[PDB]
Design a protein around this ligand. Structure first.
Ligand SMILES: Cc1cc2nc3c(=O)[nH]c(=O)nc-3n(C[C@H](O)[C@H](O)[C@H](O)COP(=O)(O)OP(=O)(O)OC[C@H]3O[C@@H](n4cnc5c(N)ncnc54)[C@H](O)[C@@H]3O)c2cc1C
Ligand SMILES: O=c1[nH]c(=O)c2[nH]c(=O)[nH]c2[nH]1
Ligand SMILES: O=c1[nH]c(=O)c2[nH]c(=O)[nH]c2[nH]1
Ligand code: FES
Ligand code: FES
Ligand SMILES: [Ca+2]
Ligand SMILES: [Ca+2]
Lengths: 1299, 49, 98, 49
């Protein structure tokens, strides 16, 4: 035994040869063809793979339901359970209420995260049919979305909650939930809960798994084979295997054993079997905390506080308490709490049993414990707290929810009865050493001291000396981490004073100053409050004309049901092969040789492709300076050297590991400064200058100079880059299915590499699970490799990148360094500005020069500056090539402008909103590049926002909060934006469409634009339906393809609805002109009669449409001609509250007013405003990529790269679309919307900067007035800028370098 | 007729909106599309031959 | 195509109409999503009907390229096409005949 | 057409034809067909959408 038997969507699966290495995600997709469940990361952070498990729990005797990450769930762990996926709850013929609500509320844009979020909400409802708003948000701590900004998901699902302008959707039309109509629990599994469980053995290619039924069997195995690796939840072992290439050839899973799952209440505490999931620890401890006296639950509450921020529901349902202990990670959140509380562990082996108190000896070395190899952990007893014993736990990470601790801590004090004198003091930390440590040199010295200021100073001095970190400490942030240890102790110190006060010892220890109280509060947020305001269409508009109406994305129902097909969801051909890229592990080196002898031994290996196999040209890339495959030298870590082709993705990965490259290092240029030192740039300096700088600075009352650094950004489209290439065997014909924004360049690059005409290569895009600029060009480095493989083999070939490969290879937003000098009057009026920008472009040109042009076109942001000089230079470096990211240089250019603008106001002593307002352009003004601002709505957006946000009254409340709180501060800022619309390269402003009307009257439309979640096909169907005067139901768009509309520009520049909307309109007008004689003869007879009459009169019912944007073309030589067709405008006011002790902050409220012209679709546009704003919130406050000094990207998955989470967004989030502002030069008077809102999230960055300034006023000793805040303003940067008594105590080989 | 290749169709459902692509040995793509669409009760714009 | 050499004849017709070699023109397939509402290939009439459609689609492309051919009367076809693309002129056209 | 590679999940279809020039269909028995390994379904007029 032997067969693995489980159920999926109620159907029995019997797997006679289960391999222990097979995950449930691979089994669902590849074995059973159920592709609604998605791969987004393979490491547990994104939830795209979420599914529900149901089983009969023999210990609690009942059917239970819980969610897991299918990417980390071994199928061999799933015997006799029932899996439900998104397909198992409903489909478009009968949507589950959860699917209907997320689709109708505009909660699905790209759709790739939708099934996972649907399964998280579905599993919550199966457990709690009437959840609270809080429980609903908690259901998604393990789910990421990059497109929606989260708001509409939570708003649609609030309709399920116990305690839960026209409208964007109507909850009154949602169908009710009938819980009796959920799928039955499989009746066999109930019959089988009778019969005893027996030990099972599964044998794979490399690994044997034993599912142990009894303790006797486990201990016997471990005594005979101590190498047998225990696996319980697999949340650590799965990561060791997939990412550290660790191979354990014998695994034993003891999850079934009752002894490892028991919970026993004893006199000293509660004992959990070591395999109890953390979800069961939470429910147990929560019950106890609710009914026991506070005095007994201090340690339980410290465990609960850590579990709050421990991943999400999917991980906690299967992650075990024993697994966290034995893992012995330096950053465990639980081990510092168990060490501080002296938790009792019981260890057993065949014939032995012993009990140890967790203490410093339990962890003797990196990832080691004191367990013998034959021993297992049986149980941990979490203790009751005693009278006079207080406990706090703390965690600070890069993002509050679902992150890895930078520093984590358990702290415990026990006082001598009836005194404030210390009997015991334990302070334990993760994140400060290669193991959980106790501050054993500091705490003994405090024994017998009274809890007072001298004890606080002694402990802080002790920690600052005891908890040293070397400059090279892994993870860097050494000043921040050390500052947190003291800051956490201060919090504990104040908390304990408060607890002493509650025990009536206030006369002995003193009252806490009320301006300090907010330092000890546990994190809590107000419930969300959101407003969406937009304009109704005219009363006379037909109900069939959907232009300007909030029509849901046309694919939203199919996205919610898992039926929408993304590239890797397409079924493989029987003869299809898999490709894995082999990349450089050196930033700059000669390739001395390549050895493929290990690769050739992997079963299913086909070939290793290199530069020698390229038929025609190895030169590729937008500027023809990139290799298809490296020749002779590599020029970044991640430079593609070749590609392995094998039958399966597993065999290809394993063969790629056996390709051994020998290098000889060459001088590497990594940083912007390295590039400046070596004169290594892409092309010459770019420059815009107007007026007389010498004159402006001589006339200025004040001059301020400084620098700003802005980190880059990974796109984190939830669907990574993917291509299938299908060779046709004739005439070099090939068809490619690709996740790309740029079908024309994909086709061009494939045809050139192969040496065939473009007419042989077809590229089809149905949709992307996000693109954001990252698939405008960089998708081609996969497409070309897969196309060569298919050409060589004559077989279809597929590659979807894993997240780590995609983050390393495909690059990102450009880091910027800028040096500025600004001249201005005492009134705040700016009279002179000189800015030098530098960007880090990496190892090919790609779009870097156009990105810098756009940064220079926006170095004014919203401000008229009479004397101005801006330069930019693009650094050529040995890093992956950076590329387009939503904003395309605009957000970097404008952040620099707002940064010196912030300093202007502070230097003048004048309110920042007054200084920004009095420098704003007016209608008719010329920009620094001489373009006239017509239809300038920025002042209306500004007045509406400042009024509707009540910005002035709120300023008064922020000042009052700051005067009444020492250790938390608020900040408030309002920021405008102007964003030029059109590609900077004039000829790319063109679009094509093709329309057919079939004889049934139905219309098949296609255009050059690609769908990536922005609702472009929805808008084009809206436009075509207005243009043709027929319902949207009669018109369909299936896909984008180079063989229906050729020579298309990329879907980029926010311009694709403007360009393709006009092409669509013209193609429809051509059809209407041909139908006009028939409409004249039958003015009332329906559309179908006109169509049939045209057909049987032999009139063509097919037409192309085309548009080019007129009158564009700027010269940098003469500073004349218009780069843009028009500008987008908007304003955002945001408020924050920072924790001055930790660097965490809440986004309290944001109000946006955005000019989208006469919106084509306000639901989609508001969605774009919210999605772009939240991506800018990530850019300016959370998202950071770290690189080694040798140029290797360290940050390669969501465990380290922290994009905004459901809990990151502004708590009050209000968005208004400007009314009565038609833009008649773009289609149906609309404006582009995708990119302009993103920079508005700088309102959060400047609110943060206002809050830091207030903290520096509170605690700084004559601190520098114009203090530096680089972007992103992460908890590290915020905490280090809040200089105080703790930072002052904590003040060339290192883990990362600034690039 | 004794065409040396006899009649042959592959139909590939796309899972979305009734969409289906058919690879057919036929002289009449339009009636193949029309007849498939009428049998299924979907518009002609969903069916590609 | 059923063996009668229709695609060969339409490539011959397009190459005459456009004045470029047959090597530059390719037909891959017939599909209802590139040309709709088509009659069966029957009645011996398919080169007559499609050859006029093809000729008309090519006349439309040549009308679009004529200003580029005037600016550059000898510069090759590849140059007129790239000049047309970078001037934002459409290089796709339908053709029809009854 | 039949030279195109099959998808890994592709199925095969065979038509069932009348052996009578003009008759009522009194009944249809599929028991034997259902026992053949790999059988999926027998489509008739009732399955037409
Ligand atoms: C997305 C994600 C987020 C995470 N977030 C956090 C977090 O915030 N904080 C944190 O501290 N951790 C976090 N983790 C790490 C991980 O979830 C925990 O360490 C988890 O508790 C491991 O438990 P498990 O049952 O999955 O261990 P497994 O992976 O099954 O095993 C882990 C180790 O324990 C051993 N083992 C298990 N049980 C026993 C036993 N009874 N006796 C002896 N050895 C045993 C195994 O042999 C193995 O070496 C996260 C992981 C993921 C994937
Ligand atoms: O002016 C632009 N050109 C682009 O090629 C592009 N790509 C993008 O994402 N935004 C922009 N903006
Ligand atoms: O007049 C004709 N109509 C047809 O539909 C047809 N079909 C064919 O083979 N020859 C003919 N001739
Ligand atoms: S794919 Fe499983 S959590 Fe991301
Ligand atoms: S809609 Fe959520 S990742 Fe795209
Ligand atoms: Ca990327
Ligand atoms: Ca670049």
């Amino acid at each position: 035994a032997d067969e693995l038997v489980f159920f999926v969507n109620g159907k029995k699966v019997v797997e006679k040869n289960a391999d222990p290495e097979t995950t449930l995600l691979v089994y669902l997709r590849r074995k059973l063809g159920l592709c609604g469940t998605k791969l987004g990361c393979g490491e547990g952070g994104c939830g795209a793979c979420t599914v529900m498990i149901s089983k009969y729990d023999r210990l609690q005797n009942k059917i239970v339901h819980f969610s897991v990450n299918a990417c980390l769930a071994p199928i061999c762990s799933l015997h006799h359970v029932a899996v439900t996926t998104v397909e198992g709850i409903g489909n478009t013929q009968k949507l589950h209420p959860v699917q209907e609500r997320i689709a109708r509320s505009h909660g699905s844009q790209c759709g790739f995260c939708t099934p996972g979020i649907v399964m998280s909400m579905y599993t919550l409802l199966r457990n709690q049919p009437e959840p609270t708003v809080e429980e609903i948000e908690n259901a998604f701590q393990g789910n990421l979305c990059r497109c929606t900004g989260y708001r509409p998901i939570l708003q649609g699902f609030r309709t399920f909650a116990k305690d839960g302008s026209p409208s964007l959707f109507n909850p009154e039309d949602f169908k009710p939930l009938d819980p009796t109509q959920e799928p039955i629990f499989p009746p066999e599994l109930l019959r089988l809960k009778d019969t005893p469980q027996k030990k099972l053995r599964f044998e794979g290619e490399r690994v044997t798994w034993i599912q142990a039924s009894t303790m006797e069997e486990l201990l016997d195995l471990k005594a005979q084979h101590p190498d047998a690796k225990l696996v319980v939840g697999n949340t650590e072992i799965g990561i060791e295997m997939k990412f550290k290439n660790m191979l354990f050839p014998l695994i034993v899973c003891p999850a079934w054993i009752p002894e490892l799952n028991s919970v026993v209440h004893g006199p000293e505490g509660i004992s959990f079997g070591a395999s109890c999931p953390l979800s069961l620890v939470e429910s147990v401890l929560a019950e106890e905390i609710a009914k026991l006296p506070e005095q007994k639950t201090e340690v339980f509450r410290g465990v609960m506080e850590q579990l709050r921020w421990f991943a999400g529901k999917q991980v906690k349902s299967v992650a075990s308490i024993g697994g966290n202990i034995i893992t012995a990670s330096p950053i465990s959140d639980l081990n510092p709490v168990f060490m501080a509380s002296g938790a009792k562990l019981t260890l057993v082996s065949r014939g032995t049993r012993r009990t140890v108190r967790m203490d410093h000896t339990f962890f003797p070395g990196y990832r080691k414990t004191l367990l013998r190899p034959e021993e297992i952990l049986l149980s941990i007893e979490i203790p009751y707290s005693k009278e006079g014993e207080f406990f706090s736990a703390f965690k600070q990470a890069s993002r509050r929810e679902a992150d890895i601790a930078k520093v984590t801590s358990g702290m415990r004090v026990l006082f001598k009865p009836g005194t404030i004198e210390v009997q015991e003091l334990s302070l334990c930390f993760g994140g400060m050493a290669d193991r959980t440590i106790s501050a054993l040199k500091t705490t003994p010295k405090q024994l017998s001291k009274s809890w007072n200021e001298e004890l606080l100073q002694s402990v802080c001095a002790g920690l600052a000396e005891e908890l040293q970190l070397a400059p090279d400490a892994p993870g860097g942030m050494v000043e921040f981490r050390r500052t947190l240890t003291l800051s956490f102790f201060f919090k504990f110190y104040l908390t304990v004073l408060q607890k002493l006060g509650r025990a009536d010892l206030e006369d002995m220890c003193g009252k806490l100053d009320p301006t300090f109280a907010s330092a000890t509060l546990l994190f809590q947020k107000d419930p969300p409050a959101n407003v969406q305001l937009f304009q109704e269409v005219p009363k006379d508009q037909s109900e069939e004309d959907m232009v300007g109406r909030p029509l849901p994305h046309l694919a939203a129902n199919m996205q919610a049901s898992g039926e929408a097909v993304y590239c890797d969801d397409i079924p493989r051909y029987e003869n299809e092969l898999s490709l894995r890229l082999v990349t450089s592990t050196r930033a700059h080196a000669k390739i001395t040789s390549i050895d493929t002898s290990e690769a050739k031994k992997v079963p299913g290996f086909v070939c290793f492709l290199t530069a020698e196999d390229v038929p025609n040209s190895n030169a590729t890339g937008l500027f023809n300076d990139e290799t298809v495959f490296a020749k002779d030298e590599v020029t970044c870590v991640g430079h593609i050297i070749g590609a392995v082709v094998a039958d399966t993705p597993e065999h290809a990965q394993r063969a790629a590991r056996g390709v051994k490259i020998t290098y000889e290092d060459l001088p590497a240029i990594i940083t912007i400064q390295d590039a400046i030192n070596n004169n290594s740039f892409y092309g010459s300096e770019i420059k815009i200058e107007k007026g007389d700088l010498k004159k402006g600075f001589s006339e200025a009352d004040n001059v301020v100079s400084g620098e700003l650094y802005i980190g880059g950004q990974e796109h984190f489209y939830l669907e990574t880059n993917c291509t299938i290439a299908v060779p046709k065997g004739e005439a070099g014909e090939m068809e490619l299915f690709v996740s790309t924004q740029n079908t024309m360049k994909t086709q061009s690059f494939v045809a050139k590499m192969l040496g065939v005409p473009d007419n042989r290569i077809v590229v089809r895009v149905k949709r992307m699970g996000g693109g954001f600029g990252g698939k405008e060009t960089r998708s081609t480095v996969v497409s070309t490799a897969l196309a060569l493989a298919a050409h060589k083999t004559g077989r279809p070939v597929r590659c979807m990148l894993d997240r780590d490969e995609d983050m390393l290879i495909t690059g990102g937003r450009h880091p910027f360094l800028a040096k500025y000098k600004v001249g201005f009057m005492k009134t705040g009026t700016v009279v002179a500005l000189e800015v030098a920008h530098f960007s880090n472009g990496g190892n090919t040109e790609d779009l870097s020069r156009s990105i810098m042009e756009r940064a220079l076109f926006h170095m004014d942001n919203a401000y008229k500056i009479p004397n101005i000089r801006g330069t930019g230079r693009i650094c050529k470096t040995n890093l992956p090539s950076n590329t387009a990211f939503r904003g395309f240089g605009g957000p970097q250019g404008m952040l620099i402008a707002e940064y010196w603008m912030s300093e202007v106001a502070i230097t003048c002593g004048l309110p920042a909103e007054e200084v920004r307002r009095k420098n704003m352009y007016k209608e008719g003004d010329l920009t620094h590049f001489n373009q006239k601002l017509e239809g300038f709505t920025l002042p209306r957006c500004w007045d509406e926002c400042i009024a509707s946000s009540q910005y002035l009254a709120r300023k008064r409340e922020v000042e009052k909060f700051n005067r009444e709180n020492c250790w938390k501060k608020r900040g408030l800022c309002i920021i405008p934006t102007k964003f030029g619309i059109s590609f900077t390269l004039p000829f790319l402003n063109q679009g094509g469409a093709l329309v057919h009307v079939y004889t049934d009257g139905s219309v098949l439309l296609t255009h050059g634009g690609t769908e990536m979640g922005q609702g472009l096909h929805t808008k084009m169907v809206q436009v075509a339906s207005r243009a043709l005067k027929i319902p949207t139901s009669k018109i369909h768009i299936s896909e984008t393809s180079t063989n229906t509309v050729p020579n298309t520009s990329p879907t980029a520049a926010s311009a694709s609805a403007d360009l393709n909307g006009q092409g669509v309109y013209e193609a429809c007008q051509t059809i209407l002109k041909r139908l006009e004689p028939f409409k004249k003869k039958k003015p009332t007879g329906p559309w179908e009669a006109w169509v049939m009459d045209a057909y049987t009169s032999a009139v063509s019912l097919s037409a192309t449409g085309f548009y080019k944007t007129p009158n564009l073309g700027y010269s940098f030589e003469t500073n004349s001609g218009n780069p843009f067709h028009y500008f987008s405008y908007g304003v955002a006011c945001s408020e924050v509250e920072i924790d001055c002790l930790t660097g965490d902050h809440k986004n309290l409220r944001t109000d946006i007013v955005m000019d989208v012209g006469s919106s084509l679709n306000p639901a989609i546009d508001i969605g774009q405003v919210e999605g772009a704003f939240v991506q800018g919130l990530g850019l300016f406050t959370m998202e950071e990529l770290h690189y080694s000094p040798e140029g290797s990207l360290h940050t390669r998955g969501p465990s380290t790269y922290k994009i905004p989470a459901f809990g990151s967004i502004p708590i009050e989030f209000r968005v208004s679309l400007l009314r009565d502002c038609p833009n008649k030069r773009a289609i149906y008077a609309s404006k582009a919307v995708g990119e302009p809102p993103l920079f508005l999230a700088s309102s959060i960055f400047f609110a943060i900067k206002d809050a830091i300034r207030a903290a520096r006023a509170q605690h700084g000793d004559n601190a520098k007035q114009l203090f530096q805040l680089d972007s992103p303003a992460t908890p590290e940067k915020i905490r280090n800028a809040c200089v105080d008594q703790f930072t002052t105590l904590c003040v060339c080989k290192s883990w990362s370098v600034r690039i």
